[PDB]
Amino acid sequence: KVFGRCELAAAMKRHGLDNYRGYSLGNWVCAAKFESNFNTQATNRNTDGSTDYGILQINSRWWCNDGRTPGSRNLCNIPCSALLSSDITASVNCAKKIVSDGNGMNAWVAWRNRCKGTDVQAWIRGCRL
Numbered sequence: 675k676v677f678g679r680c681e682l683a684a685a686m687k688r689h690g691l692d693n694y695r696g697y698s699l700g701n702w703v704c705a706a707k708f709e710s711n712f713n714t715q716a717t718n719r720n721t722d723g724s725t726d727y728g729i730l731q732i733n734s735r736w737w738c739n740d741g742r743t744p745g746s747r748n749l750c751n752i753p754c755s756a757l758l759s760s761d762i763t764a765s766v767n768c769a770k771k772i773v774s775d776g777n778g779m780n781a782w783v784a785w786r787n788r789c790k791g792t793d794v795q796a797w798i799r800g801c802r803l
């Protein structure tokens with residue numbers, strides 16, 4: 675599923691991401707835009723052999739199991755394919771664990787490089803929430 679901007683904002687808000695660990699909704703929408711272009715089915719392979727999955731491009735080295743990343747962990751205890759569902763619940767739940775591990779949203783390179791320090795509120799402007 676490819677989400678609309680306000681559609682994804684509303685879905686993230688219902689799943690408790692607005693101000694989760696101090697990160698306003700706009701941060702999460704911005705990160706999803708630049709990580710996946712709002713596409714739940716996005717995948718990208720990394721040079722170390724791990725793969726990033728879903729709307730927030732969660733990585734198989736640490737967070738999910740895809741059965742092909744040797745010596746990896748599965749900290750969200752889910753198959754990576756679950757992160758590609760049109761229902762974003764698994765992605766959101768796993769992201770909550772990632773953002774809580776100490777480095778905040780800096781875990782997401784695109785957020786650090788393209789959202790951090792910008793007017794992220796702009797990403798939810800005009801939305802009915």
Ligand SMILES: [Cl-]
Nearest residue numbers: 698699700795
């Ligand atoms: Cl915001």
Ligand SMILES: [Cl-]
Nearest residue numbers: 741742743744
């Ligand atoms: Cl694996």
Ligand SMILES: [Cl-]
Nearest residue numbers: 740741742743
């Ligand atoms: Cl393969």
Ligand SMILES: [Cl-]
Nearest residue numbers: 685761762763
């Ligand atoms: Cl959803």
Ligand SMILES: [Cl-]
Nearest residue numbers: 696777778779
């Ligand atoms: Cl933080």
Ligand code: NA
Nearest residue numbers: 734738746747
């Ligand atoms: Na893994």
